[PDB]
RNA sequence: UAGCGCCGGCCAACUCCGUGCCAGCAGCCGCGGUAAUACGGAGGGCGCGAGCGUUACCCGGAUUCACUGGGCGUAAAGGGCGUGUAGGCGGCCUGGGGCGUCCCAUGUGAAAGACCACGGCUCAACCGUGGGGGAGCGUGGGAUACGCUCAGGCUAGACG
RNA sequence: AUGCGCGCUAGGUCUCUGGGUCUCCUGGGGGCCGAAGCUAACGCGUUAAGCGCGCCGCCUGGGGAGUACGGCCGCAAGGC
């Protein structure tokens, strides 16, 4: 079977492309505590019918570009903006982490 | 704030036991009462009942001790010597059927929250299921 | 520390440091003796310990020790260095294998011949 | 001190303990007054009479 | 090879009547009947209390010298027994008694374990009608340990087997004296052997 | 009637008006290899008197040990000060795996097979006391049932 | 053919000579300035044995990076103090989902190595033939106690 | 020389500040003795250094050394 992931759209600033943040939980190898991680996947959409703060579902596909290997299957839930601003604030905190 | 109710209940039981009280009160909960019934069945506590305290649901626990000892320090031997909490918030402990611990060569009990209700180690082994490891008592 | 702290930072593994850096991870090095000088022990001990100064096949040049009763170590002797450190002498970290290259086994040993390399004495 | 010594040698302790006493160190306890000579006399007299009768 | 040299010195050092030298250690010459103190210049002085390590080492050495095998072989046998199932001591004692030389000694073909070793090495002994010439050979229950047809007329075996007439062999062994052949029945028990060794000390020694 | 065993002789000194005055202390274990153990610590100006006092103390202070198959019913770990001991049951044919002090104490108990580990501080006196406490804190199936079920 | 190390405590093995802080030994503690079981040689003894020692490296002992299994008043260790972002964690009662979690079947987890059993080299090393075990990850199904999520309520936390 | 928050575990005594039906009960704050308990000990003990939970910050022998190099912040001395 082909791998299927679920995440929230966090970007639409590209032509026929969206950025999906896939969320994963797993127990730590050593300390046993359940650890939560995330990864960003560039997904292909020809219809531009997906927007920011949309919970979508992706599938493994043949390569489209250098970083694109996934297509969008189905919209699950819409308007989940909270995750989007969470990601944006986490990303925006970086400017305050510089040295110079 | 209060982060762990079950750990709180264990600590309350331990503290009341160490001072040889006849009774202790803990805020009421289904999970707590299940743990209490499991403890009572194995004969670790005299009994429990649901009481009402100032318009709030409470569970009153009756503690059990041994006979008054001879010589200096005549305080009775405890029935609950040691009660730890295994799976804590921030580190959950899960065990399979093959990984259910044996406590004090079966002189103690390990209480599991299995898919088929809250069971002891013995019942969990017999039924052949695992779950969150709550506490060990001996 | 908390489990979260251990996840975020973890525990660091302790690193051992070699006490014989001149060997460069070898049991023995062949060197050439330069200076044969006697020196004194640290404090409670008082003697005239014989010490060589050797330049090895490595880039290093370290003080050695000469074990036994008598030696024939010259200012140009080619000798094999060894591990082991002398507690008394402050700076030596190496011994010399007696009877390998230029050095010879200390004469008329009869008890411990594996050390201080000497042939089995012929009895008649 | 006497109570402690009696504990050490497994000798049962009988006491006319009062408010400021420790009940645990006493096996057979008479909760009453240890002052007010009247009470002491009453308890000791009764006990001694029982001892004499029980010979 | 094995230990070659004086014998009853070991009798003295261990301080127990070790039956190593055949018959002389039966007659009043075992060096236990006379001068029973350990050998050496200080053999007859007041000995200090032995250490735990001393006691365990002495026990192990005594047990090993009873059978007279290499320390390496002893270690290997101990490891094999430990890795097996059951009681370590019992299994170890059973395995030590399965040696061909020891079995030959037990049957009475020889007067000593060393003589039995020599007889085995020289090919005088046969197992299941096949020549075996290895002291360390392990036998199994239901094996025929007999003398070769060539060696049957030897004076040594003759006197050995005539002197065994009306003499009771170990319960786990059955001997057909007239047929010059024997049988291995079962692994010997702890109680069967009258060894002056407490194997617990051996286990404790090898534990460290 | 009872076996005696020696742990340590230690010589302590107290200063005086320009001089050193010595005293001897002995740790002694007394048992019968049937389940009774006694440990005594005696201080006396001389070694014989120290040994005698330690023997006396051990004879007075005795503990019953609930053996079965020459081993301990259940595992235990006890901390006495900065020293921790661990005791575990063992299968027959294991031997007493212990340090000098725990081995000596458990030998006179009749214990044949046990696994032990010395943790924290390794003061012989404290280790001995911890071992004694651990032996004092052992329960059988019968005792547990009598406590719980009644 | 019988050798090699060791005999102060760890750690099993003790006397006589030469020696006089010299020659020297040493892994640690340390031993040696005329009565050395510590140096050198003998006799004796202990351990291993066609091997015995030495050096280099790794693990253990080290619970001395501690998840199993540590600590921070005075031993090394509470930030000079607040507010607060990300993150971590989280009251009581019901219901839906089954992501974590648990269970069953199944695919994989090559061979060789590890384990058990039986066999072939006269034994063993070595090898052969069978049988299991196996962390993990797919795939189908089952459970809902505890985490998660969602929906509806409660006032014991918090706020007004 | 004791991070914060919450819960449980005998009391006695002196104070500051409220409320009530005012010899007393009931809250909050600051001291001194001391149950159980804890600690290597001194000692702590309902204002825990006790029994627990969550999060954070630090420790891994003594010197060399809060030094050198590199970086950041200051007019500088200097600070991290
Ligand atoms: Zn003999």
From Swiss-Prot, chain A:
Entry keyword annotation includes Ribonucleoprotein: yes
Superkingdom of origin organism: Bacteria
Disruption phenotype: Increased generation time and a temperature-sensitive phenotype.
SUPFAM superfamilies the UniProt entry points to: Nucleic acid-binding proteins
CDD domains xrefs: Ribosomal_uS17 (cd00364)
A GO biological process held by the record: translation
Family: Belongs to the universal ribosomal protein uS17 family.
Organism name: Thermus thermophilus (strain ATCC 27634 / DSM 579 / HB8)
The entry's keywords: Ribonucleoprotein, Ribosomal protein, RNA-binding, rRNA-binding
Function: One of the primary rRNA binding proteins, it binds directly to 16S rRNA where it helps nucleate assembly of the platform and body of the 30S subunit by bringing together and stabilizing interactions between several different RNA helices. The combined cluster of proteins S8, S12 and S17 appears to hold together the shoulder and platform of the 30S subunit.
Oligomer status and interactors: Part of the 30S ribosomal subunit. Contacts protein S12.
Identification of the protein by name: Small ribosomal subunit protein uS17
A molecular function GO annotation: rRNA binding
One Pfam family this sequence matches: Ribosomal_S17
Entry's Gene Ontology cellular component terms: cytosolic small ribosomal subunit
From Swiss-Prot, chain C:
3-methylthioaspartic acid PTM positions: 88
GO BP annotations, alphabetical order: translation
Disordered as annotated region, ranges: 105-124
Highest rank taxon of the organism: Bacteria
Coiled coil segments of this chain: none
PTM comment, free text: The methythiolated Asp-88 contacts a modifed residue of the 16S rRNA close to the decoding center, and might be important for decoding center assembly.
Keyword Nucleotide-binding (UniProt): no
CDD domains: Ribosomal_S12
Pfam family, one: Ribosom_S12_S23
UniProt KW Ribonucleoprotein keyword: yes
Gene3D superfamilies referenced in this protein's UniProt entry, alphabetically: Nucleic acid-binding proteins
The entry's keywords: Methylation, Ribonucleoprotein, Ribosomal protein, RNA-binding, rRNA-binding, tRNA-binding
A Gene Ontology term for the protein's cellular component: small ribosomal subunit
InterPro entries noted in UniProt: NA-bd_OB-fold (IPR012340), Ribosomal_uS12 (IPR006032), Ribosomal_uS12_bac (IPR005679)
Residue spans of biased composition, Basic residues class: 108-119
GO molecular function annotation: rRNA binding; structural constituent of ribosome; tRNA binding
SUBUNIT field: Part of the 30S ribosomal subunit. Contacts proteins S8 and S17. Interacts with IF1 in the 30S initiation complex.
Family stated for the protein in its record: Belongs to the universal ribosomal protein uS12 family.
General function of this protein: With S4 and S5 plays an important role in translational accuracy.
HAMAP family: Ribosomal_uS12_B
Protein name: Small ribosomal subunit protein uS12
Species of origin: Thermus thermophilus (strain ATCC 27634 / DSM 579 / HB8)
From Swiss-Prot, chain D:
Highest taxon, organism lineage: Bacteria
Oligomeric form and interacting partners: Part of the 30S ribosomal subunit. Contacts protein S8 and may contact the N-terminus of Era.
Homology family: Belongs to the universal ribosomal protein uS2 family.
Function: Spans the head-body hinge region of the 30S subunit. Is loosely associated with the 30S subunit.
Protein name as it appears in the record: Small ribosomal subunit protein uS2
Organism for this UniProt entry: Thermus thermophilus (strain ATCC 27634 / DSM 579 / HB8)
Full-protein interval shown: 172 to 226 of 256
From Swiss-Prot, chain E:
Cofactor: binding comment: Binds 1 zinc ion per subunit. In a number of structures (e.g. 4Y4O, 5FDV) a 4Fe-4S cluster is seen in place of the zinc cofactor.
Domain S4 RNA-binding: 98-160
Xref: InterPro entries: Ribosomal_uS4, Ribosomal_uS4_bac-type, Ribosomal_uS4_CS, Ribosomal_uS4_N, S4_RNA-bd, S4_RNA-bd_sf
GO molecular function: metal ion binding; rRNA binding; structural constituent of ribosome
Function per UniProt: One of the primary rRNA binding proteins, it binds directly to 16S rRNA where it helps nucleate assembly of the body and platform of the 30S subunit. Binds mRNA in the 70S ribosome, positioning it for translation.
Quaternary assembly: Part of the 30S ribosomal subunit. Contacts protein S5. The interaction surface between S4 and S5 is involved in control of translational fidelity.
GO CC list: small ribosomal subunit
Lineage: Bacteria, Thermotogati, Deinococcota, Deinococci, Thermales
Family: Belongs to the universal ribosomal protein uS4 family.
Pfam families in UniProt: Ribosomal_S4 (PF00163), S4 (PF01479)
Binding site for Zn(2+): 8, 11, 25, 30
Entry annotated with the keyword Metal-binding: yes
Name of the gene: rpsD
Keywords, in A-Z order: Metal-binding, Ribonucleoprotein, Ribosomal protein, RNA-binding, rRNA-binding, Zinc
Cofactor needs: Zn(2+); [4Fe-4S] cluster
Highest taxon, organism lineage: Bacteria
The keyword Endoplasmic reticulum is annotated on this UniProt entry: no
Protein name, UniProt field: Small ribosomal subunit protein uS4
Biological processes annotated in GO: ribosomal small subunit biogenesis; translation
């Amino acid at each position: 079977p082909k791998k299927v992931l679920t995440g929230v759209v966090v970007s639409d600033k590209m032509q026929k492309t969206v950025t999906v943040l896939v969320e994963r939980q797993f127990p730590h190898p050593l300390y046993g505590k359940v650890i939560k991680r995330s990864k960003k996947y560039l997904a292909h959409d020809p219809e531009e019918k997906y927007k920011l703060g949309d919970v979508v579902e992706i599938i493994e596909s043949r390569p489209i570009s250098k970083r694109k290997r996934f297509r969008v299957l189905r919209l699950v839930e819409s308007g989940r903006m909270d995750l989007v601003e969470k990601y944006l604030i986490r990303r925006q905190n970086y400017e305050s982490l510089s040295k110079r | 704030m209060l982060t762990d109710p079950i750990a709180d209940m264990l600590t309350r039981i331990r503290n009341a036991t160490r001072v040889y009280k006849e009774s202790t009160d803990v805020p009421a909960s289904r999970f707590k009462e299940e743990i209490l019934r499991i403890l009572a069945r194995e004969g670790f506590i005299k009994g429990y009942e649901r009481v009402d305290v100032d318009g709030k649901p409470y569970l009153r626990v009756y503690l059990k001790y041994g006979p008054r000892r001879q010589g200096p320090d005549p305080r009775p031997e405890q029935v609950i010597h040691h009660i730890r909490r295994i799976s804590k918030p921030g580190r959950r402990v899960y065990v399979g059927v093959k990984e259910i611990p044996r406590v004090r060569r079966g002189l103690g009990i390990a209480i599991l929250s299995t898919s088929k209700g809250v069971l002891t180690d013995r019942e969990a082994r017999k039924l052949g299921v695992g779950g969150e490891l709550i506490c060990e008592v001996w | 520390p908390t489990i979260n702290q251990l996840v975020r930072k973890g525990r660091e593994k302790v690193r051992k440091k070699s006490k014989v850096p001149a060997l460069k991870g070898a049991p023995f090095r062949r060197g050439v003796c330069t200076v044969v000088r006697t020196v004194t022990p640290k404090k409670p001990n008082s003697a005239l310990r014989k010490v060589a100064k050797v330049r090895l096949t490595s880039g290093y040049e370290v003080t050695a020790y000469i074990p036994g009763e008598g030696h024939n170590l010259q200012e140009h002797s080619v000798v094999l260095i060894r591990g082991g450190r002398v507690k008394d002498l402050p700076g030596v970290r190496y011994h010399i294998v007696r009877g390998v290259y230029d050095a010879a086994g200390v004469k008329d040993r009869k008890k411990s011949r594996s050390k201080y390399g000497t042939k089995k004495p012929k009895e008649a | 001190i006497a109570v402690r010594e009696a504990r050490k040698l497994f000798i049962p302790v009988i006491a006319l303990a009062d408010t400021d006493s420790d009940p645990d160190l006493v096996d057979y306890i008479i909760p009453g007054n240890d002052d007010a000579i009247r009470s002491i006399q009453l308890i000791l007299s009764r006990a001694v009479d029982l001892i004499i009768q029980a010979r | 090879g094995r230990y070659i040299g004086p014998v009853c010195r070991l009798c003295r050092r261990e301080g127990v009547k070790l039956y190593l030298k055949g018959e002389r250690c039966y007659s009043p010459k075992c060096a236990m009947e006379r001068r029973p103190y350990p050998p050496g210049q200080h053999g007859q002085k007041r000995a200090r209390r032995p250490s735990d390590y001393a006691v365990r080492l002495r026990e192990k050495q005594k047990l090993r010298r009873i059978y007279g095998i290499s320390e390496r072989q002893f270690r290997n046998l101990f490891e094999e027994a430990s890795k097996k199932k059951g009681v370590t001591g019992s299994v170890f004692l059973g395995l030590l008694e399965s040696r061909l030389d020891n079995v030959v000694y037990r049957l009475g073909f020889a007067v000593s374990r060393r003589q039995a070793r020599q007889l085995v090495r020289h090919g005088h002994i046969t197992v299941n009608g096949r020549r075996v010439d290895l002291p360390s050979y392990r036998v199994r229950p239901g094996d025929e340990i007999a003398v070769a047809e060539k060696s049957r007329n030897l004076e040594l075996i003759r006197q050995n087997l005539e002197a065994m007439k009306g003499r009771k062999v170990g319960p786990w062994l059955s001997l057909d004296v007239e047929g010059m052949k024997g049988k291995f029945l079962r692994l010997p028990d702890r109680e069967d052997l009258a060894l002056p060794v407490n194997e617990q000390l051996v286990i404790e020694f090898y534990s460290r | 009637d009872f076996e005696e065993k020696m742990i340590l002789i230690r010589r302590t000194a107290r200063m005086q008006a320009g001089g050193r005055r010595f005293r001897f202390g002995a740790l002694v274990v007394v048992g019968d290899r049937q389940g009774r153990v006694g440990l005594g610590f005696g201080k006396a100006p001389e070694v014989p008197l120290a040994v005698q006092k330690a023997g006396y103390y051990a004879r007075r202070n005795m503990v019953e040990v609930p053996l079965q198959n020459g081993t301990i019913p259940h595992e235990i770990e006890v901390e006495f000060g900065a020293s921790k001991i661990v005791l575990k049951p063992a299968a027959p044919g294991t031997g007493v795996i212990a340090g000098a002090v725990p081995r000596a104490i458990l030998e006179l108990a009749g214990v044949t097979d046990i696994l032990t580990k010395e943790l924290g501080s390794r003061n012989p006196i404290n280790i001995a006391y911890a071992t004694m406490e651990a032996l004092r804190q052992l329960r059988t199936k019968a005792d547990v049932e009598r406590l719980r079920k009644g």
